Write a protein that binds this ligand. Structure first.
Ligand SMILES: CC#CCn1c(N2CCC[C@@H](N)C2)nc2c1c(=O)n(Cc1nc(C)c3ccccc3n1)c1nccn21
Ligand SMILES: CC#CCn1c(N2CCC[C@@H](N)C2)nc2c1c(=O)n(Cc1nc(C)c3ccccc3n1)c1nccn21
Ligand SMILES: *[C@@H]1O[C@H](CO)[C@@H](O[C@@H]2O[C@H](CO)[C@@H](O)[C@H](O)[C@H]2NC(C)=O)[C@H](O)[C@H]1NC(C)=O
Ligand SMILES: *[C@@H]1O[C@H](CO)[C@@H](O[C@@H]2O[C@H](CO)[C@@H](O)[C@H](O)[C@H]2NC(C)=O)[C@H](O)[C@H]1NC(C)=O
Ligand SMILES: *[C@@H]1O[C@H](CO)[C@@H](O[C@@H]2O[C@H](CO)[C@@H](O)[C@H](O)[C@H]2NC(C)=O)[C@H](O)[C@H]1NC(C)=O
Ligand SMILES: *[C@@H]1O[C@H](CO)[C@@H](O[C@@H]2O[C@H](CO)[C@@H](O)[C@H](O)[C@H]2NC(C)=O)[C@H](O)[C@H]1NC(C)=O
Ligand SMILES: *[C@@H]1O[C@H](CO)[C@@H](O[C@@H]2O[C@H](CO)[C@@H](O)[C@H](O)[C@H]2NC(C)=O)[C@H](O)[C@H]1NC(C)=O
Ligand SMILES: *[C@@H]1O[C@H](CO)[C@@H](O[C@@H]2O[C@H](CO)[C@@H](O)[C@H](O)[C@H]2NC(C)=O)[C@H](O)[C@H]1NC(C)=O
Ligand SMILES: *[C@@H]1O[C@H](CO)[C@@H](O[C@@H]2O[C@H](CO)[C@@H](O)[C@H](O)[C@H]2NC(C)=O)[C@H](O)[C@H]1NC(C)=O
Ligand SMILES: *[C@@H]1O[C@H](CO)[C@@H](O)[C@H](O)[C@H]1NC(C)=O
Ligand SMILES: *[C@@H]1O[C@H](CO)[C@@H](O)[C@H](O)[C@H]1NC(C)=O
Ligand SMILES: *[C@@H]1O[C@H](CO)[C@@H](O)[C@H](O)[C@H]1NC(C)=O
Ligand SMILES: *[C@@H]1O[C@H](CO)[C@@H](O)[C@H](O)[C@H]1NC(C)=O
Ligand SMILES: *[C@@H]1O[C@H](CO)[C@@H](O)[C@H](O)[C@H]1NC(C)=O
Ligand code: NA
Lengths: 728, 728
């Protein structure tokens, strides 16, 4: 009898998915790591050479975390002493290696405790942030030029984001943007002077006698937000003037009237930059298009080139206004925007005309614009077979919009329905990355003729291993509720028999723009639960879910903890109606927003669920950050939406927890969803005399991602689910 | 059939022990609160009068927490707006009511947020501490005289203790000592300038958007300690025009050479004060005897009047050097000290003579000196029947030490083997309080011929209630380890059958000078476990336990987490071999030091225990306070005892928990045993891949004593023990 996919298989990564991570260095070459060696590949022929031997840094004295080759291929930036901070941020030591001289640069070194470093996009200039100030090095062995003198720990951030901008706005620590040829360096400055601090203990190693108090400027819903300014400096002037001026680009008057955010920075040309600003009430955004004025040395943003993007039904963008993709001359751009029917499509703008032209349309959505050439625009969408959980690459002819080719749809339709893509520097080649429903498949293609050059990684080694395992299957389908299709997925036990009643676990995210029903192949906890424990693991995309238009996505506008919660309860009722579910053994679990939804469901008094697990849940919207929370909730004030902020807490439902078995889990060093959120849930349960199970994870953050904690959490949860379902 | 004593009975206090809390006001009368009225009783006859009617403050407008009648009976101090701080500390507002003119005093009121207040021992003067400074009121309606001007929150404490002195030295917030007739006011000043802060989050009500960080000067083992100064002010020479002069009494040279503590303050006469000082290495203490010099207005401590108390086997005193009991003229005193055999007995000292004479001797110990007259000294000891867990009142004739009379031994030997006593002002009367093995019994006695005047409270109502309940029994006995007798107790289920095998729970404290095997009657969680669940609840006093001499008590000197842990394992091993114990179902639990011992036992690899629960455990001695830890452990330095501090952690034993079921519980706002201690245990268990159960209690302190958290913790622990023992 074939073995099943066990918890130890999941925890020890016995069945490993192979990836094919390449780094394009030009229009026809990419770097790839094979046995610690960095190889350089010719995309056209597939032949390779050793770019940098695995022995090169044996006597370096430090474990090299990562590398970055300069665009001109003359130098390599070596990253070591990697100290992780938030989701994207970290600090590190850096050394530069001269590839021609085959020697390490020992003079004018990048200082220790550097926050961020980036090469210019052409050549080998460097911009780095140290002690919250910006520095530029024209040459790697030459002294740096200081750009800002205002940097102040937890107060003034130059060229790096504060906590909330990193997590919720830029999805990056960097707040610097080199112009295309590296002449200009644009950057943002954040001022957190009056932003309140979240404070929590950090225990550290057992040797630390007194716990440390971590203090982070973090605006919770309705609190004082950071303020922002934007500047551009001419880096070519640095060696000629003692102190090059950083020219400020001010936000438009429509933004200056109140609290706002800088939400996008995109260079259009060597002398034209676009900025998108967003009001604190995130249903109004403005794009400014600013030109360098050679005579005054200033940047001017013509009101005739200003573009407004607003929403009457919700917020702007999926998580923020989309980025523009400029034509070469910078006179027009393409941008994903919500059309009249509420579907996200590509609109084509002239920089000085306010009405744009939709180039795509239909009851499906464009996910992202991937590449733009003089002849074609390449994008990913879920158009294929009307499956919102599928992803394919398309090519649209710019001279004729009726000419739209699906590049990936028919390559392997049974195996591959979810693609991402990586184009070479001037889109001469593309790597397709198929991630499901079959095993991931990595392929290389030439853009000149859309022909498949070769298979880079087909996961044949894993396919051979999986043949000896009783793997679960995955069903992706939909149910019709109020004449609307709502998609779901089920991870089904091997030898699934519709005449048997199986215990069911509802795996929840359900946040705005979430998508838990898709065609991706995964080897995860659900794989073990279905394979070894014979539990069906189901997910459902209800109201508030993404990629299906604004009628569905904006259904929870100003009303988090309502329809998306009710729809999970209804999903379990619908799954019961299917006949293969044991109604006495329905559980629910989720992490982060999924933990908030799980807790709201367990506290609903629905009687549908026996038990559930909430990991790092939000419990009260006033505890979560301003940028995310307010996007959907507005402000927690009597004039705005306070009544709903107060009505949508987990704590108010404490009495209903007497009806369920609950396991509450949270990392003590969670900088994102503060441990406070679970500490308030537990106190409310204690106050009404509800027994429940709890687990804190010392010094673990939002991901509970350390090797040991990850294994511990999944082991603890597996015992809990098995006990709930009376499984030995 | 009759009911058992249930978990709800314990949690809802269905069966209440009645008390008889009186307050002696003279040599012949006492105050007693009855039906919210305050009565005054004549001790000779038992007749009473209403002192204060419960209706007097019906229009007060504030809920009165407590009352304090001035020694002359003219005024009543009304305590309200009580806000608890640590174990003894709190702030409150105060009003004074004139009992003669039947009016509240509205002039010169004691301020709000007052930290401590006390009447003089005679008359009606008041001394109070507000904002860390001392104030004196000669008359309740008159303006206060400010005594100190140096008081500073968390830095300078005048007349109040800091965290460590409150918890570990004085067992009180007060650091004020009035002279016998109220002429002088002695006080200590603590300086915490360089003492590190323990910091932890406090979540508060759900309405608090950002958690607060509590910061308390708290010296962990080996850290910088507070410094102390001692002063005496004459309250009879205070001026409205001039600032009060405080006369400092400096510590002897033997103390000033290094870190030290003030550990006792005891007035001998109107003009003589005794002070005891302890070195930071707590095996050397010095008493100074200081006399007021009318001529110079100074306090002089003659070197010929110094008394050294040292220990070669351990620390000095049970938890600190004992208090002296001075004679009427103050020329001699009686003090409990460890004799040459290591047994604590009463020694008689002359103020100017080095050698003291022991007035009691034997293989038993004096617990406390209770009263002293020119003819007799009254004391509590465990002499009777050689039972260290029993307590009786004795008197010793001062003119003939061979004449020792037991005053409580024979009153009711079957019901009463554990007494405490309260004597009237000049020991003319005494109240005996019997607390077991039977129901508590309160009686009143006259000293002249030791007449048993009357029964004050006999708990006959509770006896009637308990007749309809299947109550457990208690067995108190001993086992012999290495020719030494060590006592244990077992709470046995009702209808105990020695032919049946019962699961056993070992209830542990086991700290230095602990005593868990005694004759006290208790209605607690163990009562329910035995009565309803049929579990034997055992406790054992092994090496390090108290009241049995230093050979046993000092066995753990410099070696915490050694013999006291081994001895708990040995006792359970011995109990496991008894025919009435199920060796497959032995559990262990404890709180605080008991949580440390439980965890050390569970991590020992003994294999004796199936499961256990640690509540607020110490996990590493370097995390606990200096005063308690160093008393037993010395300093955590390589030259002193660092190796043993490092070898005695729970964390080092994490791998051994693989074979046990462990439940770890801790309050997040524990200012005493910081949450950090359990946070380090859980991280060590996660690091070795050991599954365990956990529960944090939001905002609960060391006591986890709020009504809802108390019910929740005992509910959660009951489920855990029942699951461990396969009990439905
Ligand atoms: C409170 C909120 C929110 C919402 N959120 C967002 N937002 C946008 C980005 C910035 C973020 N601050 C807010 N991205 C989200 C979510 C969300 O809750 N999940 C669920 C989830 N599930 C699992 C198993 C997780 C496992 C480990 C760590 C996090 C996990 N999180 C999620 N899964 C994939 C993406 N994301
Ligand atoms: C860490 C340490 C120590 C030692 N400690 C001391 N010391 C002397 C006084 C000052 C204190 N800081 C140190 N008195 C102690 C202990 C101790 O651990 N217990 C056990 C225990 N049990 C139960 C059910 C408890 C229930 C709630 C709260 C505390 C509990 N504590 C104990 N019981 C009665 C007295 N005491
Ligand atoms: C991939 O193969 C091609 C063809 O062999 C290499 O192209 C160059 O071809 C010239 C002939 O004019 C040879 O002299 C060289 O060996 C090649 N140039 C360089 C700069 O290496 C090509 O370089 C190969 N690429 C890799 C990454 O190995
Ligand atoms: C960051 O923002 C703070 C205000 O939150 C600015 O601080 C003020 O600076 C002015 C000088 O122009 C002072 O008069 C005020 O006393 C300051 N206010 C506070 C609340 O500190 C600060 O100047 C800004 N810093 C930068 C570099 O923009
Ligand atoms: C470079 O120029 C900047 C911009 O004028 C200087 O920054 C000013 O510095 C002084 C204090 O020394 C203050 O008057 C201003 O508030 C600063 N403005 C900003 C935007 O920082 C900076 O000090 C100059 N550097 C050198 C080396 O002269
Ligand atoms: C990259 O772009 C910048 C901006 O267009 C170029 O700098 C300009 O060069 C032109 C000549 O072609 C002059 O008219 C201007 O004085 C320059 N402007 C500034 C602001 O420096 C720059 O030459 C380009 N760099 C490279 C290496 O091609
Ligand atoms: C104790 O606090 C109370 C309340 O803050 C003070 O009592 C009066 O209280 C009213 C409102 O309850 C206020 O308008 C006044 O400021 C108070 N004044 C007087 C003269 O009573 C009170 O003063 C405080 N007690 C002391 C002794 O300072
Ligand atoms: C309490 O004791 C103090 C100190 O012995 C007494 O004060 C002394 O009283 C006599 C008067 O009979 C004077 O000769 C001394 O000068 C006083 N000494 C000081 C230090 O003030 C006082 O008699 C007693 N007070 C009460 C109220 O009984
Ligand atoms: C008080 O206890 C200390 C620590 O045990 C005793 O210290 C001595 O000094 C160190 C310990 O850190 C060792 O070098 C010696 O072995 C100890 N000296 C001896 C045993 O003579 C100190 O002696 C104790 N004091 C008393 C009065 O017994
Ligand atoms: C980084 O720190 C180390 C040791 O603390 C030092 O030897 C080295 O010079 C530092 N590097 C730079 C670039 O300052
Ligand atoms: C933005 O949202 C607020 C709150 O719903 C609303 O009052 C305002 O009219 C909105 N703007 C648009 C363009 O709908
Ligand atoms: C008790 O009775 C005596 C007389 O027998 C009386 O003088 C005394 O004041 C009474 N005491 C109380 C407290 O009522
Ligand atoms: C408290 O102690 C510090 C040294 O830690 C000293 O500088 C300061 O003067 C002291 N304050 C008082 C009032 O004694
Ligand atoms: C008393 O002492 C304080 C603090 O030193 C001072 O500020 C105040 O003026 C003094 N009062 C008199 C009457 O000397
Ligand atoms: Na009697």
């Amino acid at each position: 009898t074939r073995k099943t996919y066990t918890l130890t298989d999941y925890l020890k990564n016995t069945y490993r998915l192979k990836l094919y991570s390449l780094r394009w260095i030009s229009d026809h070459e990419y770097l790839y790591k094979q046995e610690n060696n960095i190889l350089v590949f010719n995309a056209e022929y597939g032949n390779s050479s050793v770019f940098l031997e695995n022995s090169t840094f044996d006597e370096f004295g430090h474990s090299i975390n990562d590398y970055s080759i300069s665009p001109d291929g003359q130098f390599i930036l070596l990253e070591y002493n990697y100290v992780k901070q938030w989701r994207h941020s970290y600090t590190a030591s850096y050394d530069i290696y001269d590839l021609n001289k085959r020697q390490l640069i020992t003079e004018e070194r990048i200082p220790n405790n550097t926050q961020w470093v980036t090469w210019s996009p052409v050549g080998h200039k460097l911009a780095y942030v140290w002690n919250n100030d910006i520095y530029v090095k024209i040459e790697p062995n030459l002294p740096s030029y200081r750009i800002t003198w205002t940097g102040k720990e937890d107060i003034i951030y130059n060229g790096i984001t504060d906590w909330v901008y990193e997590e919720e706005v830029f999805s990056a620590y960097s707040a610097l943007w080199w112009s295309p040829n590296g002449t200009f360096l644009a950057y943002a400055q954040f001022n957190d002077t009056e932003v309140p601090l979240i404070e929590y203990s950090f225990y550290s190693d057992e040797s630390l006698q007194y716990p440390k108090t971590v203090r982070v400027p973090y605006p919770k819903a309705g609190a004082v937000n950071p303020t922002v300014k934007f500047f551009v400096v001419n880096t070519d002037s640095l060696s000629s003037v003692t102190n090059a001026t950083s020219i400020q680009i001010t936000a438009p008057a429509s933004m200056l009237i109140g609290d706002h955010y800088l939400c996008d920075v995109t260079w259009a040309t060597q002398e034209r930059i676009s900025l998108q600003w967003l009001r604190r009430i995130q249903n109004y955004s403005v794009m400014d298009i600013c030109d360098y004025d050679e005579s005054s040395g200033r940047w001017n943003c013509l009101v005739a080139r200003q573009h407004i993007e607003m929403s009457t039904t919700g917020w702007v963008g999926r998580f923020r206004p989309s980025e523009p993709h400029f034509t070469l001359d910078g006179n027009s751009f393409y941008k994903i925007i919500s059309n009249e029917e509420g579907y996200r499509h590509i609109c084509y703008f002239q920089i000085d005309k306010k009405d744009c032209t939709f180039i795509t349309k239909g009851t499906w959505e464009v996910i992202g614009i991937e590449a733009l050439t003089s002849d074609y625009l390449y994008y990913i969408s879920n158009e294929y077979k009307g499956m919102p959980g599928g992803r394919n690459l398309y090519k649209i002819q710019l001279s004729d919009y009726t000419k739209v080719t699906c590049l990936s749809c028919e390559l392997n339709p049974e195996r591959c329905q979810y693609y991402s893509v990586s184009f070479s520097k001037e889109a001469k080649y593309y790597q397709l990355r198929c991630s499901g429903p079959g095993l991931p498949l990595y392929t290389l293609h030439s853009s000149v003729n859309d022909k498949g050059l070769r298979v880079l990684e087909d996961n044949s080694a894993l396919d051979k291993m999986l043949q000896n395992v009783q793997m679960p299957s995955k069903k992706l389908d939909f149910i019709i509720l109020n004449e609307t299709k709502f998609w779901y997925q089920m991870i089904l036990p091997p030898h699934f028999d519709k005449s048997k009643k199986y215990p069911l676990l509802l795996d929840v995210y359900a946040g705005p723009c979430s998508q838990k029903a898709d065609t991706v192949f995964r080897l995860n906890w659900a794989t073990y639960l279905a394979s070894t424990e014979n539990i069906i693991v189901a997910s459902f995309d209800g109201r508030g879910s993404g990629y299906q238009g604004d009628k569905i996505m904006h259904a929870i506008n100003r009303r988090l903890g309502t329809f998306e919660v009710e729809d999970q309860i209804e999903a379990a009722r619908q799954f019961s109606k299917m006949g293969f579910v044991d109604n006495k053994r329905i559980a629910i679990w989720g992490w982060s927003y999924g933990g908030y939804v799980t807790s709201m469901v367990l506290g609903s008094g629905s009687g549908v669920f026996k038990c559930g697990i909430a990991v790092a849940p939000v419990s009260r919207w006033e505890y979560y950050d301003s940028v995310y929370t307010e996007r959907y909730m507005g402000l927690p004030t009597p004039e705005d939406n306070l009544d709903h902020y107060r009505n949508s807490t987990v704590m108010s439902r404490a009495e209903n927890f007497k009806q369920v078995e609950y396991l509450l889990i949270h990392g003590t060093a969670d900088d994102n969803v503060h441990f406070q959120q679970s500490a308030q849930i537990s106190k409310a349960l204690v106050d009404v005399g509800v027994d429940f199970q709890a687990m804190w994870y010392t010094d673990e953050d939002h991901g509970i991602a350390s090797s040991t904690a990850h294994q511990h959490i999944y082991t603890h949860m597996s015992h809990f689910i098995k006990q709930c379902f009376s499984l030995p």
